[PDB]
Write an enzyme that holds these catalytic residues in place. Structure first.
Site, PDB file in Angstrom:
ATOM      1  CG  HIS A 190      -1.905   1.101   1.250  1.00 49.05           C
ATOM      2  ND1 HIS A 190      -2.957   1.181   0.358  1.00 49.05           N
ATOM      3  CD2 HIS A 190      -1.984   2.211   2.022  1.00 49.05           C
ATOM      4  CE1 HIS A 190      -3.660   2.269   0.611  1.00 49.05           C
ATOM      5  NE2 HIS A 190      -3.089   2.915   1.614  1.00 49.05           N
ATOM      6  CG  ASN A 215      -4.131   5.714   3.879  1.00 48.57           C
ATOM      7  OD1 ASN A 215      -3.949   5.284   2.729  1.00 48.57           O
ATOM      8  ND2 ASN A 215      -4.457   4.911   4.904  1.00 48.57           N
TER       9      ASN A 215
END
Ligand SMILES: [Ca+2]
EC number: 3.4.22.-
Length: 256
Positions: A190, A215
């Site tokens: 990620h 994020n």
């Protein structure tokens, strides 16, 4: 004092600043974090060079690519692929020209229109790969050096791209406002961005430091879509929470 120096850097705290104007996005239920982190890194580099905080179309990058058709929703990619796409197409539309919706990842690459803005105008990639990458595990015994590299890049380019294992931020009592003291894993899956840092006193009264991490899970997740994490983490961790860092080496004339 100021917003970003060697001890403290938080550009978010200045509402009237380019980078603070880059709103958190949600990649949705597609493995497209590589696109969001890569494009944000370019967006901060652009901010640092005096450009407006205009969002790059993640959808264009997801849908426009040479070669055989790929499953761009189920399989993530890398930042190296992001540059590859730029250099191939020479066009980065603005998000407004081709807005993101994850259920549309897979659509035919759209025809560029006259009225579309090219966010990669006058840009180019420096020689010889076009990026620089670092692995935390290679700095296991000189983490101070790793920290310094990342701080410098955050100061100069506005962010770095970082890779983590998503599971490490999926703790049941994850809180955006608390500084997380997290382990990493041997691998990552990620992309996020490191966008700042500072010092804090932890629960045991000891002086520590944190990264501020952006994020792409929307602004509800974490602390308005960000979180803070201890740079070094728990003593017992075999792996640092930040697995890898990637920086783009782009040449961009300084104002516009
Ligand atoms: Ca593992």
């Amino acid at each position: 004092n100021m917003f970003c120096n060697k001890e403290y850097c938080n550009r978010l705290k200045d509402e009237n600043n380019c980078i603070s104007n880059l709103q958190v996005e949600d990649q949705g239920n597609c493995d497209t974090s590589w696109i969001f982190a890569s494009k944000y890194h370019l967006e901060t580099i652009r901010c640092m060079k005096g450009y407006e905080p205009t969002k790059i179309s993640a959808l264009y990058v997801a849908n426009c690519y040479k070669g055989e058709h790929k499953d761009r929703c189920d399989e993530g990619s890398s930042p190296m692929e992001f540059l590859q796409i730029i250099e191939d197409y020479g066009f980065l539309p603005a998000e407004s020209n081709y807005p993101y919706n994850y259920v549309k990842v897979g659509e035919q690459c759209p025809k560029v229109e006259d009225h579309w803005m090219n966010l990669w105008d006058n840009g180019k990639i420096l020689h010889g790969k076009g990026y620089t990458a670092y692995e935390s595990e290679r700095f296991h015994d000189n983490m101070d050096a790793f920290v310094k590299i990342i701080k410098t890049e955050v100061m100069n380019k506005g962010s770095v791209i970082a890779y983590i294992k998503a599971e490490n931020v999926m703790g049941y009592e994850f809180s955006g406002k608390k500084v997380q003291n997290l382990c990493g894993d041997d691998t990552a899956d990620h992309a996020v961005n490191i966008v700042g840092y500072g010092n804090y006193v932890n629960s045991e009264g000891e002086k520590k430091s944190y990264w501020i991490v952006r994020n792409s899970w929307g602004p509800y997740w974490g602390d308005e879509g960000y979180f803070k994490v201890d740079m070094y983490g728990p003593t017992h961790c075999h792996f640092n929470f930040i697995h890898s860092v990637v920086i783009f080496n782009v040449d961009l004339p300084m104002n516009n």
